[PDB]
From a paper:
Correct folding of the Lpt system component LptD is regulated by a periplasmic metalloprotease, BepA. Among the LptD quality control proteases, BepA is different in that it also has chaperone activities and influences the insertion of other OMPs into the outer membrane, and its deletion renders cells sensitive to multiple antibiotics. The primary sequence of BepA indicates that this protein is a member of the M48 family of zinc metalloproteases, of which there are four in E. coli. In addition to the N-terminal M48 protease domain, BepA has a C-terminal tetratricopeptide repeat (TPR) domain.
The structure revealed the TPR domain, consisting of 12 α-helices forming 4 TPR motifs and four non-TPR helices, in tight association with the M48 zinc-metallopeptidase domain. This forms a nautilus-like fold with the TPR subdomain cupping the metallopeptidase domain. Helices 8 and 9 contribute a tight turn at the end of the TPR domain, allowing the M48 metallopeptidase domain to be cupped by the pocket formed from TPR motifs 2 and 3. Interaction of the protease domain with the TPR pocket creates a larger negatively charged pocket, which is also noted in the structure presented by Shahrizal et al.. The protease domain of BepA consists of the active site α-helix H4 containing the HEXXH motif, and an active-site plug formed by a loop between helices H6 and H7, residues S246 to P249. The active-site zinc ion is coordinated by H136 and H140 within the HEXXH motif, E201 contributed by helix H5, and H246 on a loop that forms the small α-helical active-site plug. Coordination of the zinc ion by H246 acts as the fourth ligand, therefore suggesting that a rearrangement of the active-site plug should be required for proteolytic activity. We did not observe any density corresponding to positions L146 to I194, and considering that this section is in close proximity to the active site, we expect that it may form a dynamic regulatory region. The importance of residue H246 for BepA function, and the conformation of the active-site plug observed in our crystal structure, suggests that the solved crystal structure may represent a proteolytically inactive form of the protein.
Numbering used by the authors: 44 to 145, 195 to 484
The structure:
């Protein structure tokens, strides 16, 4: 099959994936993972396609890829990764399966490790994280009643660990510090998307709290997040206070301060804080938070002003379309609401429903208007997309 045929099949399956409950659509987590992924991709050879990285809520460690550079990572990866370089080693491994066009054979696994460790190193991560991560997987398997799921897909015989140790040993020592974002992402993942063995335990928080400064702050953030989720909003504000004071332009802290404020009907305080943020105009996380606060504060037009632009510039972001729908609903702009929901459905592969909704929007809009022309042309595009997905 061609590269264009690979893109098409990939788009079909990305859409089916987005229609599934386990997909994590958190703005902070999505932005972190794709920023990390793009860093690795920028240092890889034989990249012939865009890459996209997806995070699914699943407490079994695994990672896989499918057509068109689409890499899926289970959230349990954050539980297993002690540092950012270890998380990156798994992502680099996956990228290498893709770039080499490859469960997998012994030879494919070896190649993905060898290519992946070079990408790791070129991207400024510690090569030793790769064998260290694998040794951890084997150590868990050695005394559990069953192996980690990822080993079913990516077999890990001893020879593979030995080869990886050797490659890392041959490269120069490169001790590296995890970004604060790694620890905050880990805290958020295990704390907000907890499930089964994915939990933000007191033991992890206490270990961090006596770690380096980045770990200390992520623990405190973790405590604030958990207070927020247990309806302890005063405690959450108080725990967050020193974090926000030390880094008033940190998007993780601004995001959480917004949710704390909204939870206590302080929409105006939250709006004002976000309007003063320096990176408001360029950081999609801050834009969505502001839109959400405007909605909660009963200013749906201000929300729509943000979200029309946001959805235009972030068309594959299902959060944008959902909030746009809510804003337009609250304005009783019902054709625009229907159209926003249609795009939500189209991203999840539910093309019939998308077309139905757009057809309603078109029918109750002025005949021969510019708006009606826009809806009818979008219906055209979705029908045609439906035809090419027919074979599947
Ligand atoms: Zn593999």
């Amino acid at each position: 099959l061609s590269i264009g045929q690979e893109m098409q099949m990939g788009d079909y399956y990305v859409r089916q994936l987005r229609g599934s409950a386990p997909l994590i659509n958190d703005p902070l987590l999505t932005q972190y993972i794709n920023s990390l992924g793009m860093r690795l991709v920028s240092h890889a050879n034989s990249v012939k396609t865009p890459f996209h990285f997806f995070l699914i809520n699943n407490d079994e460690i695994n990672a896989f890829a499918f057509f068109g550079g689409n890499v899926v990572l289970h959230s349990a990866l954050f539980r297993y990764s002690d540092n950012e370089s270890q998380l990156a080693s798994v992502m680099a491994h996956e990228i290498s399966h893709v770039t080499q066009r490859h469960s997998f054979t012994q030879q494919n696994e070896q190649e993905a490790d060898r290519i992946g460790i070079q990408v790791l190193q070129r991207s400024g991560f510690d090569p030793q994280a790769m064998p260290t991560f694998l040794e951890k997987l084997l150590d868990q398997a050695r005394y559990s009643s069953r192996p980690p799921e990822i080993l079913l897909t990516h077999p890990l015989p001893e020879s593979r660990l030995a080869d990886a140790r050797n490659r890392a040993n041959q490269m120069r020592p490169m001790v590296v510090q995890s970004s604060e974002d790694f620890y905050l992402a880990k805290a958020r993942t295990l704390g907000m998307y907890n499930s089964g063995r994915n939990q933000l335990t007191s033991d992890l928080l206490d270990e961090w709290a006596k770690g380096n400064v980045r770990q200390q702050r992520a623990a405190q953030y973790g405590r604030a997040l958990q207070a927020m989720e247990a309806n302890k909003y005063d405690e959450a504000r108080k725990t967050l206070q020193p974090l926000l004071a030390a880094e008033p332009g940190n998007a993780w802290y601004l995001d959480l301060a917004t949710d704390i404020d909204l939870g206590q009907n302080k929409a105006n305080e939250a709006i004002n804080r976000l309007k003063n943020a320096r990176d408001l105009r360029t950081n999609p996380v801050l834009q969505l938070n502001l839109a959400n606060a405007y909605l909660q504060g009963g200013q749906p037009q201000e929300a729509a002003n943000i979200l029309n632009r946001y959805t235009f510039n972030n068309k594959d972001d299902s959060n944008g379309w959902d909030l746009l729908a809510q804003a337009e609903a609250a304005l009783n702009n019902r054709d625009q609401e229907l159209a926003a929901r249609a795009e939500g459905y189209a991203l999840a592969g539910r093309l019939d429903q998308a077309i139905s909704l757009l057809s309603s929007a078109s029918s109750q809009v002025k005949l021969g208007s510019l708006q009606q022309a826009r809806y009818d042309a979008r219906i055209d595009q979705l029908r045609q997309l439906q035809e090419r997905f027919k074979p599947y």
